[PDB]
Amino acid sequence: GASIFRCRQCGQTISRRDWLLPMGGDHEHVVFNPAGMIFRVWCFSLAQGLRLIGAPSGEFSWFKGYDWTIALCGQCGSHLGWHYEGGSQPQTFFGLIKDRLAEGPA
Template identity: 45%
Template sequence: MQTTYPHPPCSLLKSAPPGSDSNLEAKLKASLDDPKKKKVLCRTCGAEITDNSFATRVNNSHEHSFFNPHGYVFQIRCYSAATGCRYSGKPSYEFTWFAGCSWQIAVCKACLSHLGWRFQSDSTYFYGLIRDKLTE
């Protein structure tokens, strides 16, 4: 049985203004050069994915545990930006973990390892990255 969810804007995070992707990328690049920031790296290849300044709370928590339709459990951490990721596939609402948000698979730009998912609604987006696929 397929589960579908309505497509209203989710209010999980503050809305990102249109065109803010480039602002987030600039902020991320600047913060990755700051030695006080903890870099979040791909565990497979060591590429820089994001940093701890982009950690965000979604539904009142930074970290969540979910299972997929096949029964695999994922512990994810939420980030407002992850420029070391690229995402692929069409957005899907099927078995979404955050009501009102579609998801796409997020992979490491450097080695293409699956790191998690990019979730988005009409007004916002964030990354849910698999804790065990990252290192600091």
């Protein structure tokens, strides 16, 4: 009933509840960017159906040791979160914005 996450804007398949990743002890992290926008980020070890934009950047990174790339919905272009890489245990993961996903049956 609530096992997969889809893009809220279009329905694209994005991730699964089974793939939630407790980073630093919680899968949920609330953060702001330099423009003051607050994001409720859920960390996932894996995601699909995204389009990762550009090359990674360490600037303003919310997770120590990781560089990020913007992750858009590959279907509709909605900003769904970020892909993190260049770090350690794990090397990579996804930080997705909770309220931009819809949860539902597989």
